């Protein structure tokens with residue numbers, strides 16, 4: 377409505393900055409308040425990389441993707457402001473949870489939400505590049521959203537154990553290498569937050585994958601979920617399923633599971 381108006385730009389003074397989140401495990405991400413509307417938010421601060429992230433996020437709007445609310449990118453300090461997710465990241469949520477609440481149908485629900493955001497990124501021709509539980513956020517009622525904290529892990533630093541063969545070997549990243557990562561995510565969900573390839577050391581992973589070794593079905597993981605895990609770990613990226621197919625599968629499993637859980641809830 378005026379010459380220097382930008383619909384994404386907030387004023388730094390709109391925001392009360394509070395503590396850094398997660399002991400600093402997320403990097404420069406703070407809790408903050410958008411004082412106008414009260415509202416607790418999260419605020420990442422710091423440069424091109426930062427500007428790219430802001431520019432990408434403006435392009436992304438989906439129920440299971442952490443929602444951008446504003447940026448402060450006119451002058452330093454640079455801010456990105458997103459909605460706040462009250463239970464923190466998925467990996468720790470799983471490690472700490474009451475499995476009476478975080479039951480089997482919830483695990484399927486978590487998987488359905490994540491595949492749903494990824495199908496969205498797939499349709500939009502984006503590539504996440506670092507999909508993992510540590511990168512998903514949890515809110516109320518097992519709401520899960522996909523994020524990215526640019527956390528890089530061992531070219532660069534790599535999360536070796538979530539990384540597709542063609543990405544480790546040839547540096548080829550794609551939505552199909554996300555599909556492979558999503559498969560490790562499934563295993564993380566299935567174990568409630570166990571480290572992948574337990575007991576195996578990082579230097580051996582590729583060679584083992586190339587001999588066609590894959591992680592075994594976790595105790596209690598449904599057969600069909602494992603089927604999905606292993607389809608995600610097809611060696612040829614072209615052989616992997618789409619996130620559209622993946623999300624379709626999990627929704628269906630999810631709906632079947634809740635009929636059972638609700639019923640079980642009634643009886644108890």
Ligand SMILES: Cc1ccc(C(=O)Nc2ccc(CN3CCN(C)CC3)c(C(F)(F)F)c2)cc1C#Cc1cnc2cccnn12
Pocket residue numbers: 397398402405418419420429432433436441442456457458459460461462463464465502503504505513522523524525
């Ligand atoms: C302040 C903040 C800023 C940014 C982001 C963020 O995730 N950025 C993001 C950047 C890019 C992409 C997509 N690209 C990936 C790369 N790829 C190469 C291209 C496509 C996506 C994605 F969600 F779409 F994946 C997200 C999260 C937060 C948070 C927070 C928050 C809220 N509640 C809590 C509770 C505890 C801890 N943190 N926290």
